[PDB]
Amino acid sequence: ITAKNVNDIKGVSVKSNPDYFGAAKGKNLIIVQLESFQRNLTNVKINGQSITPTLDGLQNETMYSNQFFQTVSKSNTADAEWSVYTSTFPSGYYTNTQTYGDRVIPSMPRLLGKNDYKTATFHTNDASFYNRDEFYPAVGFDKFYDRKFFGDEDVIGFSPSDEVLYNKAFPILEEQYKNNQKFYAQLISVSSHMPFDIPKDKQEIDLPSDLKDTELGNYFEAVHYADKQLGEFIQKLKDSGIWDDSVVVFYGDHHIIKTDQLPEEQKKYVNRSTQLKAEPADDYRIPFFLHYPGMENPGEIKNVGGEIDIMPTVMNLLGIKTGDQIMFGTDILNSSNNYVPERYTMPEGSYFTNSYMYQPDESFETGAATNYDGTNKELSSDVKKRFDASRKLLQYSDSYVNNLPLRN
Amino acid sequence: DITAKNVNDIKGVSVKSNPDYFGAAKGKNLIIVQLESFQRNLTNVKINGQSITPTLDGLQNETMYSNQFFQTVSKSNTADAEWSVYTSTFPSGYYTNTQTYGDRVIPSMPRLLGKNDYKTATFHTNDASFYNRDEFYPAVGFDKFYDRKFFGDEDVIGFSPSDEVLYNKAFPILEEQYKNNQKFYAQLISVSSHMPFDIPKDKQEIDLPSDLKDTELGNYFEAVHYADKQLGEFIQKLKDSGIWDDSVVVFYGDHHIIKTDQLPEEQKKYVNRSTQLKAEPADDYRIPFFLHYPGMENPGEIKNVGGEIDIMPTVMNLLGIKTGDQIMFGTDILNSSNNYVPERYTMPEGSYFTNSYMYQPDESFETGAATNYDGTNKELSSDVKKRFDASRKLLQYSDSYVNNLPLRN
Ligand SMILES: [Cl-]
Ligand SMILES: [Cl-]
Ligand SMILES: [Cl-]
Ligand SMILES: [Mg+2]
Ligand SMILES: [Mg+2]
């Protein structure tokens, strides 16, 4: 298995002389993974109250996507991290951070570490969760900051709040910045994790009575809190000068609300402005925002992507050659026909494109392609090719990951 | 390979082989009322001499009742309560079970009663599309459900007809079954005390002190008082008609709604401390539970703990119905003394409540904490470990069992 072979199997055409290559050469990298944020519940107003004003404001000054998809399996948050760090698929069976925490895993932090970046990840819960204390070394992060680093002050749910996350991380980044140390920081938010129970004094949305004592109402309070704290973190990055010297990426780890299951009177709260009339496609959309210094071309990215695509997309902006490193993702700024294979909650060979989703049943022929306007799509040759490629890619990714060398 | 015996062995609660009260209510009707957002630490409260729940307080002298009965809910609280009660299986840590498994043939209390000559119905004044009830109720084998279409749009409180309309329109249906010798199980789901607790001004009967007036807790007290009043009127009709003397009647709160430790300091004096558990969330997770059956000679406080999953096995014993090979994760609370209640979703998996302490894990079992209900720490002994392991295994088995249920089509 080689990098070329994998790319040929996927069959997505990527520019040989890529645009934006090294547009952010030598810049820092800050990535924030936002817990349980989904695109169809962002940019929503409840009686004039914006739920995600921070994300809404970023649309004018970033490249962002309305068709960016989660690529997760059994352990959703950890599968998101797996996808992003490794550009390999999460398992259909295992939790990869558990099963492969004993391997030497090629990765984004490892590659950046070979290009003079110090690398760290930040999360306020204990790193024993999902085997993170083994996984983070396995992917070659120089450091991870876990509950031991963050206090037990201002707990929301089961660990310190996003406010504590950003306030304790920022000074570390500021000191690296002042000392001319190129850095990659990954922050994993948590305050908007289910059950979305936010202290009363931190709830800022006055909910209408059809949202009171509902999962969706609680979700909106938690997302609003998380978005607020993100905005305060961004303002500190701007004031400090870090923003103008860094690539910054924000994405939701995965969806949490099944919007077609909502009570009928709550459905009016779902954002329909970029709705896909196919499930689970619509819900599987996660917000995605990308900033880099001196960007001249902000706006909507048309090519679809998933979490596995973040690494190749970012490495291109940072001007880093990936060489022989196997990546199952694609640089989304240098392709136009990308697609995203899915598994676990969907059968193997399921995938999303920029215009339709395919899902098999007992066989390819008994499956269904559904256009994003809701109409059926005939199972043509191209639909078949992506199904076959998707299944082969998953096989290769599973085999590749399973054959990684042991750390000991 | 999951059997009823295996599940019971995993839980490890000792249940009398020759049970007491078996068939004490053989052949009687069953009426169960699920009271929206009632919690035990906000019942039997007086505000300046005014009783908030005088109906429930009065029942204490003539029922078996519990001061340590717990909610067992997850993502969709009201529906998870119904799930727990009808199925005696745990709500999911991930799904809303009434949504995800509404396409299954689900073994249940109404299904089992239907095989013992009961006609079964559930009543709720909102639209049955909510939480997939219009599929869930058939899935568990209710003969009928009566929803908003049946109740009309008179006397709306909040978003649907009042508890008064619920009881007034249900009663004549029960009365006709009674007169025609049709044994029945009726499940009524109240709604007037749902948040935001908006009760019409002419229906507010508590004169609130200024530290409660126009506050969430104040509105909560008016709504609970209204709901308790209407429950009392329903009971009086059951008594007058003769149905009361021919029926097992169970009342329970679906789940708590007020986080009492988050109240303003001056409102905390309103919380009932008389049977306080000095552990959270144990204290708030207590829901009222009252059981009546005709010719009961032994009214008073049930010492053994229970949760919503325990209602089915407890009731089937009273009705003299053998459950056979039907898998139940709950326990007959009148024939055990060491029952415990696993919790999830708002607590980590392996958390549980006993009659004397709560356990909650952290990163591992060993880094968790057992807290006695007097507030003191409890050392993590072998028995504490066994219940943690059993709790986690029970949740796994329940999730697997429910996921493997056959499709209705
Ligand atoms: Cl008790
Ligand atoms: Cl559930
Ligand atoms: Cl139990
Ligand atoms: Mg997550
Ligand atoms: Mg409820």
Numbering used by the authors:
A (entry chain A): 203 to 610
B (entry chain B): 202 to 610
Can you list sentences taken from the study reporting this PDB entry?
Lipoteichoic acid (LTA) is an important cell wall component required for proper cell growth in many Gram-positive bacteria. The LTA primase LtaPLm initiates LTA synthesis by transferring the first glycerolphosphate (GroP) subunit onto the glycolipid anchor and the LTA synthase LtaSLm extends the polymer by the repeated addition of GroP subunits to the tip of the growing chain. Regardless of whether LTA synthase or primase, LtaS-type enzymes, have the same overall architecture. They are composed of an N-terminal domain with five transmembrane helices, which is followed by an extracellular C-terminal domain (eLtaS) containing the catalytic site (recently reviewed in Ref. 12). Although the enzymes share the same fold, substantial differences in the cavity of the catalytic site and surface charge distribution contribute to enzyme specialization.
The lipoteichoic acid primase LtaPLm transfers the initial GroP subunits to the glycolipid anchor but is unable to extend the chain further. To identify differences between LTA synthase and primase enzymes, the soluble extracellular enzymatic domains eLtaPLm and eLtaSLm were overexpressed and purified from E. coli and their crystal structures were determined at 1.75- and 3.0-Å resolution, respectively. Although both enzymes were monomers in solution, as assessed by size exclusion chromatography, eLtaPLm crystallized with two molecules in the asymmetric unit and eLtaSLm with five molecules in the asymmetric unit. A structure/sequence comparison of the two enzymes highlighted two sequence insertions in LtaP that form two extended loops (residues 544–552, loop 1; residues 561–570, loop 2), which interact with the long helix α18. The insertion loop 2 in eLtaPLm forms a negatively charged protrusion, which is repositioned through Phe-566 on α18 by ∼2 Å compared with eLtaSLm. This also leads to the formation of a surface groove, which extends to the catalytic site. The specific loop 1 and loop 2 sequence insertions are conserved within primase homologues suggesting that the resulting surface features are specific for the function of primase enzymes. In this study, we found that Thr-307 in eLtaSLm is phosphorylated, whereas the corresponding residue Thr-279 in eLtaPLm is unmodified. Specifically, our work revealed that LtaPLm has a smaller active site cavity, lacks a second GroP binding site, and that two conserved loop insertions results in subtle alterations to surface cavities. Based on our functional data, which showed that residues Ser-486 and His-488 are required for LTA production, we suggest that the absence of these residues is an important factor contributing to the inability of the LtaP enzyme to produce a PGP polymer.
